[PDB]
Design a protein around this ligand. Sequence first.
Ligand code: BFX
Ligand code: NAG
Length: 333
Amino acid sequence: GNTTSSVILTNYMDTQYYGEIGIGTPPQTFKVVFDTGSSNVWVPSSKCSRLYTACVYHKLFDASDSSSYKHNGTELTLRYSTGTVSGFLSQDIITVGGITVTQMFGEVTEMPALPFMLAEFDGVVGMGFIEQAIGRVTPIFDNIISQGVLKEDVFSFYYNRDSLGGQIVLGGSDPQHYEGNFHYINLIKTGVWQIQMKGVSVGSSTLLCEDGCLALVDTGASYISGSTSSIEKLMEALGAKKRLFDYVVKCNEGPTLPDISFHLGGKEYTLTSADYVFQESYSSKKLCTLAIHAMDIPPPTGPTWALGATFIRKFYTEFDRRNNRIGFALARH
Ligand SMILES: O=C(C1=C(c2ccc(CCCOc3cc(F)ccc3Br)cc2)CCNC1)N(Cc1ccccc1Cl)C1CC1
Ligand SMILES: *[C@H]1O[C@H](CO)[C@@H](O)[C@H](O)[C@H]1NC(C)=O
């Protein structure tokens, strides 16, 4: 085939990037994060009690309004950090840009109020592999590959600062949003969008990951994350102060913070202070949050760093299923 499909994304506060899909006949539309760090499609169910704040303010999929729905009903569960997300399996037609695919997805009937009530999007489209799919449910991109319509079996992400919030392209990349050529790194193994990282540097010197470490390239994560211990070290080197849920610096010190570099494949990928400090002020009397957090990701996938939107904003990213690799290029804004 010779198809590419693009979907325009909205940038909410540099932490959530989401675009529209349609499910059912007629289509019920949902704003969703396209997430390389998971493998299932989830939308809230019309069966979610209105006594869940995580459902009350989002769009709900109603199977009773869709002529193309096919019942399944298998329970599926995710033991998330703040509580259980559970729902049940359903099948319907899903449109993503130009593409229409028959897809099995989860209808959520309960999920914790935090963090999900603070999502400006309604659902999640996992762009990961079947190896990590709850219930081994065939992921959406697997089903699109099977249609044999895509120009290439890749998909690409542009995240803007904050005007276009971002863009996902299915079947290729959009050269309007990057400069030069991609540089590629092979997946450690098929099944996870995760690559080797060869070190993390502050200024000119390698501080961390000296012996090597893992990097999950996670389009659904807001931040760059590392293990509690790695991040403690990094923040020490930055002179950043720990809070209960983030790290901060005195706002005036923000622009003088050193570059942080991630050695991936044959290249160093450098973020300057402007790429990782939320410069909400320049005052010595105010504290500024960093777009780098600690997260201890458990096995099998962790422990690992995760390169989320903080990283992807700077580096346009292509996820290549044909060749089991990830490519980066400098984004154009
Ligand atoms: O944290 C994540 C990430 C992952 C994830 C977390 C939870 C799930 C369970 C399904 C959650 O389903 C929903 C979540 C909503 F916010 C609103 C409606 C629904 Br339905 C699936 C994936 C997997 C790994 N990659 C990031 N979020 C939540 C999130 C991310 C970024 C900002 C806010 C929030 Cl709540 C998913 C990707 C969007
Ligand atoms: C939902 O139901 C079955 C359980 O019997 C499950 O194996 C499968 O993934 C779903 N059905 C189809 C048709 O794929």
